[PDB]
Amino acid sequence: RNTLHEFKKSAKTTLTKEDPLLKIKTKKVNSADECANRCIRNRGFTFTCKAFVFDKSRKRCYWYPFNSMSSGVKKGFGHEFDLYENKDYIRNCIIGKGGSYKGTVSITKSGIKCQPWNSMIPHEHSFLPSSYRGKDLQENYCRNPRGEEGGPWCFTSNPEVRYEVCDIPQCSEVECMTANGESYRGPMDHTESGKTCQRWDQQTPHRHKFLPERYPDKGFDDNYCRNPDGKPRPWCYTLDPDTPWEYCAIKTCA
Incomplete structure (x- = not known):
């Protein structure tokens, strides 16, 4: 399964209000995707999960009922953390x-x-x-x-x-596109036939050469439609194992 793609990653970030400790449910897991599933399915929660941080070293993840935009909440930093805010809220x-x-x-x-x-x-x-x-x-x-x-x-x-x-x-x-859309940077994440884009930082279900770290110019954030290799329009590896990739249908600037 998979739900990590539902989220908006902000690297080396974490969240904190400041309140008297306050209930912040935590649990050790193997992966960030594992945190994801628990978050969107809300199982064993007395509240609604809007975001979550994963700790890459300690392999613990923390579940939050708010996000970077919520009423009075500071962000922060942490070399080993990643913040994942649900896209539905932001x-x-x-x-x-x-x-x-x-x-x-x-x-x-x-x-x-x-x-x-x-x-x-x-x-x-x-x-x-x-x-x-x-x-x-x-x-x-x-x-x-x-x-x-x-x-x-x-x-x-x-x-x-x-x-x-x-x-x-x-x-x-x-965000509308232009020419062959090599400059597109908008937030569309679904293909033309409605399939869901796979995150660039992932190599599953489709292996691919586009490591975001090797490509700081192309805008490979999350799973947004992009056009790094100069196709006629932006595109994405899909989450259907049967279709490696597919074009996205972004509106042009008219």
Whole structure:
């Protein structure tokens, strides 16, 4: 299995609020991917895991309920640590239907302040968080708890408009490309047929010559679509063992 690709790596970094010790669940493991799975599946947690640090030497990983952007939390440094923040919480963009969007946009297309989900004012409604556990209906952030076609949306703070889609750019269009896209550096991580890009720093399921350390110019972070070798457009090794690689379909700057 695999979930490490769901995460945004920031090397030699770690996290800390400062609070009176505070519960920070920890456990020895073999790999970072092992931390990943536990994190996204939340098994044995009294809370939701947004990020986690892995200690490459001690081979321990620590699970956090917040991330580098959370309310008052300092970062740091550590030669032997790596921080892995879930992409669902930090991206400023959507893959397709936006079922997994957990960023912090709280404004509709037409620009209305969203109504908080813990509220029935102005609009009465069934989407209490209690019923949509793990869909993160917090504050008044746009969400898409049922994975429907409109993408993320929210109840509106205008009595007249009950709900409305939030205009969140698609990861394929936020940073746009140009020429053969050798300069593309945007955050798209899925291929044209919808397959999921394998992380450049990994050699599995596909072995490949592109070690990020040997290629400081190409932007081989995480699993983002890139074009190091001058194809007609950016591309990625996939997570399907049956397809070594595949083009990504990034929107051009028009």
